[PDB]
């Protein structure tokens, strides 16, 4: 079960990198909302950031966590340096996607998909 | 024989001899050496050997492979290490080419070869972007070809041809938006392979 | 002495013969720290000694270039520096040691 | 259901919603949002237009190939109305002008034209009819705009009894003549967001219980006109028009409790405070107090 | 009176179609053939179509090549900065409907998903003459415009 | 000043919406009593970083699990 | 074999140094450049008077597609689907069934002209010269939908253009 590490040698070190990334994202949201002239609140921007972290809470592989942080840092670099445009930043919010039905009956009415 | 490509035995022997030469000098890393019937020399190495093997081929006086022609990856999902990393090098001094191949999986970094060849910089970014292979100690590893915020690595065999999202302008929000991809005409998959074996010379033992 | 090497960034060498003797001697000195039975040492000593003999046995630079087959003598000097740099790195890598790890069984099988 | 209009797909651009809609007045403020939401889910949209084709160009990207169809029409020509509606399952009337012209007065845009669309739609067999009226429509209003809206609202209910009639308050949005109107310069107002009105219209098309009903689309908050105009100037970072238009702006927004509203179509009204900056950002070179 | 309005439409229509200043997005292959339309054999300048115009003095955008998802937002921004009246000519299969990359994950399947399009020039690429035919077809479209006639009847 | 420091910590925490004001006590563990998660604690530390105008590293911040450590930590 | 593009040593004799000084001060080489553009001013331009004059083309030119017939009027296409298989862009969509008289014929033959790359592979693959790229290149449209050709449109193109198409095939079939 011996593998080559990416950065972290265990989950404790991986979690430290996660918290540093979260802090960097949390502090950058107010600037992003201003520079990109977004129509969302800073609270919405930070709520979205927290949502994105939370969905990955179950990972226990430090290598997977390392890659998630690597990708998170690249995403933050694109935002901070304004490589993204307004459309790229707003793609986290799916503003034109009408909500898909979730309960069995609503999905049964509209189509065949599970 | 007008239609058959002629063989070149002189080049086949030279490359075979140099293949043994390389494998004798770097036994720590070389796993396999082979020469194709059209005379291309391939060195297969353990991924730890990337920097030492490339440095030897660039700097050694009987090698002098000063030019990195190309660096790419191939995705083979059936393998435990699905990604094959391919270095194609050119030696102007000896008017010869060589191919170096190693392997990695999704979670195992490969050492960046920018220290050996500055040409490797963008190639490794392209491999990261298209295949998701992470290169360690790269001066600036980030996407290069895909759109900003693009999720996934399109050149993987299990990434769909048309992707997952498509763009359009939306008037209500006055910007370009991304939405799940729907196609007016689905791409029509073709099953073209003949059920009769073509090349007996490559038949795999059963 | 030639006016230019023809290669941008590669300056002419005023005393190429003595420069090559210093480099080839340095390479042979470094190769002494490598185990006697490492292929890199045996092969690199062999070629280095072949070039060193030609350098001592030919006083005319253009006759020497014709014998070394390494292009301009300034290119041969640069190649000597490259070998010396490599030899030092080879001592840290120790590539003469056994194969670190075998590949998985089908790692190199093609077609699948 | 005829086989051609059974829904298919996942509700995207290339899907088939099963809606075949004729939208009169599609080239205006409300029309561009309605057509967009119809084309988002892959509806067939027929756009009768009176203007130059150049002025309908913004509608073309709103639907997949073939889903937006354009036709000429004249408000006074019933044959041109029949051509536009005889293949549709729903007719939406968004025709109107905030002012009168030498050729069309308020009695034309708000009575004669809606009645002709309703009558021809009834004759052609159109199942559903959605007619936009006004919250403050009233035959005793000081506004000839609002008096006509009341007369026409009654004639449509008589001509096409199953019509869904929608009575919006002042609508605000990027292309509105409300927030923009103040920025370009006694009374309580309850303005409603454009996307809310659009969603209400779309959900009325689908809801079978909406047939024959009259809805009032209003925003979530009531504001004094003075407090609203003050807020507009603050948001526009600015130091703080016909006669009929002025009367409308000073007409207090009726409170019709008996009518169903946006919540009866599954639509949550959007507060003005969330969207005001979106509309007013381009005007740049403390939330308003609300009535309990 | 209607006679006056008919002749002013003719005047302003004639001026606008006789002085079509294009902005070309030279996105890919098709840009080469628009260069050949400017080149001496066809000399687009002789029709009043200046070779290159800045986006803010432009009347027609020519989308000449493949529009990727990465480039689509930039193209929309340029279209939104064009003073009116403005027209769009889609040139080549890629811009028309995605063409040979229609099934790609990174390609917009036709520039009409991003901007409205007045003329579709088919071909991969359309010849310089085919593009010139499309430009002259856009001129005829402008000749049919009746903005003042319709204004007078509101 | 130690009560001055201690007051500010409670000032910042009160503003933090997720913490119920009544439940808060100077010796209340964020994750046991107040029911906050890991990232809730991270946001608290950045708030203290702003109030006291200095940077609190992750190794230091991971241990500040109730207001008392924060008051105690600042004093050092 | 190689040659040097820019390996020359300027002469330093006073006559040559003064020659370069005169060039620097009198702008002589700039004047020489003016002569070249002047000589073009008086050359006949290469422009042709389109659409009254047309650029030359060959019989091989790949333009708008068309479906052809035999001299009797029977369709040449037998719904073999080789064109659809080879099409690099999947621009061709075909359906087929036995015709009322039992003949093997298509019921759908669509070419998405905005997917097509005008490569001519379909007309190479066709065994009966049914689908061809014709000589027409002036068929730009005002709408996207007009470039989604079905069988009726393609048959009409064949009837419209057959006179020219047949002569072009006659001039090039011995090269195929
Ligand atoms: C200020 C007064 C300027 C008067 C401008 C008059 C321009 C003359 C003109 O319109 O060209 C004749 C034009 C020339 O015809 P054309 O523009 O259609 O071009 C035909 C010739 N080829 C094929 C080469 C392009 O006649 C018209 O098109 C009719 C429109 C007349 C517009 C003027 C109305 C008065
Ligand atoms: C008895 C004694 C009497 C005493 C008086 C005697 C006086 C006579 C001797 C003086 C003669 C001097 C001529 C003065 C002209 C200016 C000369 C000059 O400035 O040339 C140098 C300048 C730059 O040259 P450069 O190659 O860059 O190198 C120099 C710097 N290292 O080169 C340039 O300026 C290049 C200009 C670039 C622009 C080119 C576009 C113009 C080309 C066509 C011009 C045609 C001439 C127009 C004629 C006028 C029309 C009214
Ligand atoms: N916006 C608001 O605040 C509210 C609006 N409403 C009603 O909603 C409907 C649309 O609102 P809005 O979209 O803002 O109105 P707009 O003026 O923005 O658009 C009006 C539409 O009516 C068409 N139209 C006007 N006169 C005629 C005519 N004589 N013959 C044919 N077509 C004509 C216009 O077409 P053209 O472009 O050709 O003129 C345009 O498409 C109207 O009935 C309006 O009264 C009700 C309550 C609030
Ligand atoms: S339409 Fe053809 S020529 Fe034009 S950019 Fe696409 S592939 Fe290239
Ligand atoms: S010309 Fe090429 S791309 Fe077009 S339909 Fe024929 S085979 Fe397909
Ligand atoms: S056009 Fe030719 S190749 Fe295509 S289906 Fe018909 S006969 Fe076969």
- Contacting subunits of D (3+ beta carbon pairs below 8 A): A, B, E, G
Whether residues D174 and B170 touch (CB distance < 8 A) is answered with no
- How far apart, in whole angstroms, are the C-alpha atoms of residue D279 and residue D170? 14
- How far apart, in whole angstroms, are the C-alpha atoms of residue D144 and residue D242? 12
Name the residues of F annotated as catalytic: 37
The closest ligand to the CA of D54 turns out to be 3
Taking CA–CA distances from D61, the nearest residue in chain G reads G144
Residue bearing the CA closest to ligand 2, atom 26? G24
CA angle D272, D275, D280 (to 5 degrees): 105
D104: its two tokens: 């069309």
Whether residues B172 and D36 touch (CB distance < 8 A) is answered with yes
Q: Determine whether the annotation assigns residue G116 to a binding site.
A: yes
Cβ neighbours of residue D27 closer than 8 Å, sequence gap 6 or more: D47, D49, D50, D51, D55, D56, D59
CA angle A21, A22, A25 (to 5 degrees): 85
Complete DSSP assignment for D85-114: HTT-SEEEE----SS--SS--HHIIIIIHH
Distance, in angstroms, between D19 CA and closest chain G CA? 20
Whole-angstrom Cα Rg for chain E:
16
Residue E64 contacts residue E96 (beta carbons within 8 Å):
no
Whole-angstrom Cα Rg for chain G:
29
Across the interface, of B109, B143, B178, the residue whose CB is closest to A91 is: B178
Residue D237 contacts residue D284 (beta carbons within 8 Å):
yes
Cβ of G150 closer than 6 Å to ligand 2, yes or no, is: no
- How far apart, in whole angstroms, are the C-alpha atoms of residue G176 and residue G120? 13
Residue E127 contacts residue G58 (beta carbons within 8 Å):
no
Ligand 3 binding site (Cβ under 6 Å of any ligand atom): D 25, 27-31, 50-51, 75, 94-97, 104, 109, 132, 134, 168, 170-171, 178
Residue D250: which of D145, D128, D112 has the closest Cα? D145
Taking CA–CA distances from E37, the nearest residue in chain G reads G47
CA B75 to centroid of chain Cα atoms: 8
Across the interface, of E114, E118, E146, the residue whose CB is closest to D52 is: E146
What SS3 class is residue F42?
helix
Taking CA–CA distances from B168, the nearest residue in chain D reads D61
- How far apart, in whole angstroms, are the C-alpha atoms of residue C39 and residue B22? 9
- How far apart, in whole angstroms, are the C-alpha atoms of residue E121 and residue E137? 10
| Segment 44-73 of chain A within 8 Å of chain F by CB | 50, 53
Residue D160: which of D124, D107, D207, D136 has the closest Cα? D124
Question: Where in G3-162 does DSSP place strands (E)?
Answer: 65-67, 92-98, 104-112, 131-133, 148-149
Whether residues D14 and B171 touch (CB distance < 8 A) is answered with no
Distance, in angstroms, between A13 CA and closest chain E CA? 36
Residue D288 contacts residue D231 (beta carbons within 8 Å):
yes
Distance E101 CA to ligand 5 centre (A): 13
What residue ranges do the domains of chain D occupy? 1-292
Whether residues E122 and G140 touch (CB distance < 8 A) is answered with yes
Cβ neighbours of residue G57 closer than 8 Å, sequence gap 6 or more: G135
- How far apart, in whole angstroms, are the C-alpha atoms of residue C112 and residue C104? 14
Residue E119: which of E130, E104, E108 has the closest Cα? E130
Question: For this experimental structure, what is the resolution in angstroms?
Answer: 2.3
Q: Does F58 contact chain A (CB < 8 Å)?
A: yes
- How far apart, in whole angstroms, are the C-alpha atoms of residue D60 and residue D65? 9
Omega prior to C111 cis, within 30 of 0: yes
Which of A12, A14, A17, A19 is the mutation pick for testing F, counting most F CBs within 10 A? A19
Distance D146 CA to ligand 3 centre (A): 14
Q: How many Cβ atoms from other residues are within 10 Å of residue F16's Cβ?
A: 15
Round to the nearest angstrom and report the end-to-end CA distance of chain G: 40
- How far apart, in whole angstroms, are the C-alpha atoms of residue G165 and residue G170? 9
What SS3 class is residue C111?
coil
Q: How many Cβ atoms from other residues are within 10 Å of residue F41's Cβ?
A: 17
Q: How many Cβ atoms from other residues are within 10 Å of residue G88's Cβ?
A: 12
CA atoms in the 13 A half-sphere facing the CB of E117: 29
Question: Where in chain C does DSSP place strands (E)?
Answer: none
Distance E13 CA to ligand 1 centre (A): 9
Q: Determine whether the annotation assigns residue E124 to a binding site.
A: yes
Residue bearing the CA closest to ligand 1, atom 3? E11
Burial D258-279 (b: 16+ CB within 10 A, else e): ebebbebbebebbebeebbebb
The closest ligand to the CA of D104 turns out to be 3
**Interface of chain B against chain C, CB under 8 Å?**
21, 24-32, 44, 46, 48-49, 52-53, 55-56, 58-62, 64, 76, 78-81, 93, 103, 202, 204
In which residue are the tokens 């509606």 written? D85
Whether residues E76 and B176 touch (CB distance < 8 A) is answered with yes
In which residue are the tokens 């051509």 written? D83
In sequence order, the β-bridge partners of residue B35 are B41
Residue bearing the CA closest to ligand 5, atom 6? G122
Complete DSSP assignment for A39-94: SS-HHHHHHHHHHHHHTTTT---HHHHHHHHHHHHHHHHHHHTT-S-HHHHHTTS-
Q: Determine whether the annotation assigns residue E111 to a binding site.
A: no
Q: Determine whether the annotation assigns residue G8 to a binding site.
A: no
Which of E69, E70, E73, E74 is the mutation pick for testing A, counting most A CBs within 10 A? E73
Residue G105 contacts residue G79 (beta carbons within 8 Å):
yes
Residues of chain E with C-beta less than 8 angstroms from the C-beta of A82: none
- How far apart, in whole angstroms, are the C-alpha atoms of residue B181 and residue B152? 15
- How far apart, in whole angstroms, are the C-alpha atoms of residue D16 and residue A66? 43
Cβ of E14 closer than 6 Å to ligand 4, yes or no, is: no
């Amino acid at each position: 079960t011996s593998v080559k590490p990416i950065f972290s040698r265990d989950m404790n070190e991986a979690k430290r990198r996660v918290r540093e990334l979260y802090r960097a994202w949390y502090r950058e949201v107010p600037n992003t909302v201003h520079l990109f002239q977004l129509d969302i609140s800073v609270k919405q921007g930070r709520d979205k950031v927290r949502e994105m972290f939370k969905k990955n809470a179950h990972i226990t592989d430090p290598r997977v966590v390392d890659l998630l942080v690597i990708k998170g840092k690249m995403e933050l670099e694109e935002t901070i340096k304004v490589w993204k445009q307004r459309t790229h930043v707003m793609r986290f919010f799916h503003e034109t996607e009408a909500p898909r039905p979730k309960d069995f009956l609503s999905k049964f009415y509209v189509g065949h998909d599970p | 024989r007008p239609t058959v490509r002629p063989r070149n035995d002189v080049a086949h022997k030279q490359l075979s001899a140099f293949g043994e030469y390389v494998a004798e000098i770097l036994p720590k890393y070389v796993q396999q050496v082979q020469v194709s019937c059209f005379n291309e020399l391939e060195i297969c190495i353990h991924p730890d050997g990337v920097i030492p093997v490339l440095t030897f081929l660039r700097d050694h006086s009987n090698a002098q492979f000063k030019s990195l022609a190309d660096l790419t990856a191939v995705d083979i999902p059936t393998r435990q290490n699905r990604f094959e990393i391919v270095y194609n090098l050119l030696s102007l001094r000896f008017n010869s080419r060589i191919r170096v191949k190693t392997y990695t999986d999704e979670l195992t970094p490969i050492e960046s070869s920018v220290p050996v060849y500055k040409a490797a910089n963008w190639y490794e970014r392209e491999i990261w972007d298209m295949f998701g292979v992470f290169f360690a100690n790269h001066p600036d590893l980030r996407r290069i070809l895909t759109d900003y915020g693009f999720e996934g690595h399109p050149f993987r065999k299990d990434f769909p041809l048309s992707g997952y999202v498509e763009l359009r302008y939306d008037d209500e929000v006055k910007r370009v938006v991304a939405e799940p991809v729907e196609l007016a005409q689905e791409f029509r998959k073709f099953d073209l392979n003949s059920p009769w074996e073509a090349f007996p010379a490559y038949r795999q033992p059963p | 002495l030639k006016k230019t090497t023809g290669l941008v960034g590669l300056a002419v060498c005023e005393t190429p013969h003595e420069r090559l003797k210093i480099l080839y001697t340095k390479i042979l000195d470094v190769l002494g720290h490598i185990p006697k039975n490492a292929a890199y040492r045996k092969y690199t000593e062999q070629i280095t000694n072949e070039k060193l003999s030609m350098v001592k046995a030919e006083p005319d630079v253009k006759k020497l270039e014709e014998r070394l087959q390494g292009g301009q003598i300034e290119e041969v000097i640069l190649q000597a520096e490259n070998e010396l740099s490599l030899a030092r790195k080879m001592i840290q890598w120790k590539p003469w040691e056994p194969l670190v790890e075998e590949p998985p069984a089908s790692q190199w099988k093609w077609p699948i | 259901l005829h086989h051609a209009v059974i829904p298919h797909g996942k509700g995207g651009r290339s899907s088939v919603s099963g809606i075949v809609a004729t939208v009169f007045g599609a080239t205006g403020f409300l029309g561009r949002y309605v057509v967009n939401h119809l084309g988002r889910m892959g509806s067939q949209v027929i756009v009768p237009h009176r203007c130059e084709p150049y002025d309908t160009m913004h509608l073309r990207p709103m639907g997949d190939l073939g889903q937006i169809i354009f036709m000429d029409w004249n408000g006074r020509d019933k044959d041109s109305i029949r051509r536009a509606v005889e293949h549709s399952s729903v007719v939406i009337n968004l025709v109107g002008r905030e002012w009168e012209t030498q050729n069309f007065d308020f009695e034309d845009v708000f009575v004669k034209i809606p009645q002709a669309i309703a009558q021809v739609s009834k004759e052609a067999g159109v199942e559903k009819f959605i007619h936009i009226s006004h919250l403050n429509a009233d035959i005793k209003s000081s506004s000839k705009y609002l008096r006509s809206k009341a007369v026409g609202e009654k004639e449509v209910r008589e001509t096409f009894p199953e019509a869904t009639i929608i009575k919006p308050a002042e609508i605000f949005g990027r292309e509105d003549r409300f927030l923009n109107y103040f920025a370009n310069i006694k009374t309580v107002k309850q303005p409603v967001y454009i996307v809310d009105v659009t969603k209400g219209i779309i959900n009325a098309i689908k809801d079978p219980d909406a047939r024959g009903k009259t809805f009032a689309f209003v925003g979530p908050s009531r504001y004094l006109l003075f407090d609203l105009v003050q807020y507009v100037f603050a948001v526009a970072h600015r130091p703080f028009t016909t006669r009929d238009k002025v009367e409308r702006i000073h007409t207090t927004d009726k409170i019709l409790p008996h009518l169903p509203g946006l919540e009866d179509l599954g639509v949550e009204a959007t507060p003005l405070e969330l969207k005001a900056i979106e509309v007013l950002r381009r005007h740049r070179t403390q939330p308003a107090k609300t009535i309990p | 009176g209607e006679y006056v309005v008919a002749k002013l439409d003719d005047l302003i229509n004639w001026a606008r179609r006789s002085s079509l200043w294009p902005m070309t997005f030279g996105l890919a292959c098709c840009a080469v053939e628009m260069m050949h339309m400017a080149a001496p054999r066809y000399d687009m300048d002789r029709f009043g179509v200046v070779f290159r115009a800045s986006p803010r003095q432009s009347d027609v955008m020519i989308v000449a090549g493949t529009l990727t998802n990465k480039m689509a937002p930039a193209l929309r921004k340029v279209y939104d900065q064009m003073p009116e009246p403005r027209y769009v000519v889609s040139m080549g299969s890629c811009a028309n409907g995605g063409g040979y990359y229609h099934y790609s994950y990174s390609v917009v399947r036709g520039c009409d998903r991003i901007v409205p399009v007045d003329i579709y020039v088919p071909g991969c690429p359309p010849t310089a003459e085919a593009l010139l035919y499309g430009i002259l077809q856009l001129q005829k479209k402008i000749k049919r415009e009746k903005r003042l006639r319709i204004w007078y009847r509101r | 000043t130690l009560e001055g420091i201690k007051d500010r910590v409670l000032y910042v925490l009160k503003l933090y919406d997720k913490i119920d004001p009544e439940k808060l006590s100077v010796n209340s563990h964020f994750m046991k009593d107040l029911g906050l998660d890991s990232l809730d604690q991270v946001e608290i530390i950045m708030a203290m970083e702003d109030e006291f105008g200095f940077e609190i590293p992750d190794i230091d911040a991971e241990k500040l699990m109730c207001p008392q450590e924060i008051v105690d930590y600042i004093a050092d | 074999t190689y040659k040097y593009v820019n390996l020359r040593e300027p002469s330093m004799d006073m006559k040559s140094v003064t020659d370069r000084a005169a060039q620097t001060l009198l702008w002589t080489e700039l004047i020489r450049g003016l002569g070249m553009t002047l000589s073009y001013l008086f050359r006949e331009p290469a422009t042709i008077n389109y659409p009254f004059e047309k650029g030359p083309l060959s019989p091989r030119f790949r333009g708008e597609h068309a479906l052809r017939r035999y001299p009797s009027g029977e369709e040449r296409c037998i719904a073999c689907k080789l064109c659809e298989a080879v099409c690099p862009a999947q621009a061709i969509t075909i359906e087929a069934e036995p015709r009322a008289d039992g003949s093997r014929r298509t019921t759908r033959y669509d070419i998405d002209m905005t997917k097509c790359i005008y490569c001519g592979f379909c007309q190479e693959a066709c065994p009966v010269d049914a689908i061809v790229e014709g000589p027409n290149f002036e068929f730009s449209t005002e709408t996207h939908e007009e470039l989604l050709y079905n069988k009726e449109k393609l048959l009409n193109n064949g009837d419209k253009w057959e006179a020219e198409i047949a002569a072009n095939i006659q001039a090039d079939y011995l090269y195929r």
